[PDB]
Amino acid sequence: DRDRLRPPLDERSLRDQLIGAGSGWRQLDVVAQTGSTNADLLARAASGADIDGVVLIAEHQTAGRGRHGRGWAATARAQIILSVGVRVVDVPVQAWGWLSLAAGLAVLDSVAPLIPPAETGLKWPNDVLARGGKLAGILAEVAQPFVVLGVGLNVTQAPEEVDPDATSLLDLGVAAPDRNRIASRLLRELEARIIQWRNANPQLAADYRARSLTIGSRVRVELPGGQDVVGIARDIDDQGRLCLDVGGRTVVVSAGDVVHLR
Ligand SMILES: Nc1ncnc2c1ncn2[C@@H]1O[C@H](CNS(=O)(=O)NC(=O)CCCC[C@@H]2SC[C@@H]3NC(=O)N[C@@H]32)C[C@H]1O
Known part of the structure; x- marks a missing residue:
């Protein structure tokens, strides 16, 4: 089936x-299998390792992490599963939220030419959407002085294997996606966006919008704690927070799950 469309990654080539x-990347490793690439890089940093510019890619991930204690499902060689380390202590804490948004932008730009149906772009905060389906998810975690950025991108991953609301490049019409080429494009886009974020480049916010x-x-925004708020999204502030219009009132959301309504 799709297993024939899932060749292994070339670590040496990458x-x-x-x-x-x-290039700003200092280290790149491709592991056959791990619990969570995010957890692994967090573990390295916890033991005193300098993970700035360090890339970890896994062919398979058995205990993936989602946002707010949720999970992330995957099968072998069906996704691009990676985490990178970013030194952030030199940047004001108020701006760390934009690093997360920058990662989503990089992932989208890396695969956008291959894809052009309706509803293709970024859903706040870190959802790469295409034809309504979730093509990629991004998780950012803090380990001072670092932030670990995790990316799960469905290349040939079937929605029935992971999530009913999911989609993949293959399901979008890309017959033979090359993960080696895409992973390369992704990490070069990511490096550029990280540099822009570090220097507070106005183009980052402009490109995101x-x-x-x-x-x-x-x-409808589902807030942490179970509360729902319905309104119209208007803008993103300087902290990467979502600005909502609720009957003329402004409600600023730092975290939550967004559902686009009719
Ligand atoms: N395959 C998948 N493709 C679409 N969707 C899915 C899928 N696997 C479940 N899902 C669904 O999406 C939900 C997770 N949503 S979320 O709260 O916004 N979390 C995220 O999207 C961030 C996920 C980050 C995963 C990366 S991959 C490597 C790195 N290490 C790690 O543990 N996390 C990061 C849970 C499940 O319902």
Whole structure:
């Protein structure tokens, strides 16, 4: 079936392309299997390792982490599953939220040319959507002085294997997606967006708003704690928070699950 469309990654090739002069990535490893790539890089940092510019890719992930204590499902070689380490202590804590949004933007731009149906872009905070389905999910976790950015991108992953609301490049029409080429594109896009975030480049916010599916749409936001708030998304502030219009009132949300309404 789709197993024939899932060749292994080439670690040697990825290292040659992404490690060296002109690139900020210092280390890249491809593991056959792990519990969570995010947990692994957090564990390295917890033992005193400098994980800035360190890339960890897993062919398979058995205990993936989602946001708010949720999970992330995967089968072998069906996704691009990676985590990167980013030094953030040199940047004001108020702006750390934008690092998360920058990652989603990079993932989208890396695969966008391959895909162009309706509802294709970014859902606040870190959802890469295409044709209404979730193509990629991003998780950012703090381990001072670092932030670990995790990316789960469905390449050939069937929705029936992971989640009914999911989608993949293959299910979007991409017959033979090359994970080696896509992973390379993703990490080069990611490096650029991280640099932009670090230097507070205005283009980062401008580019995000251009790909936003949430801004200008009627939304139901499910807040931490179980409360729901219905309004219209208007903008993103300087902290990466979602600005909602609720009957003329402004409600700023730092975290929550967004559902685009009719
Ligand atoms: N395959 C999948 N593709 C679409 N959707 C899905 C899928 N596997 C479940 N789901 C569904 O999405 C839900 C998770 N939603 S979420 O709260 O916004 N969390 C996220 O999207 C962030 C996920 C980050 C995963 C990356 S991958 C490597 C790294 N390590 C790690 O443990 N996390 C990060 C749970 C499940 O209902």
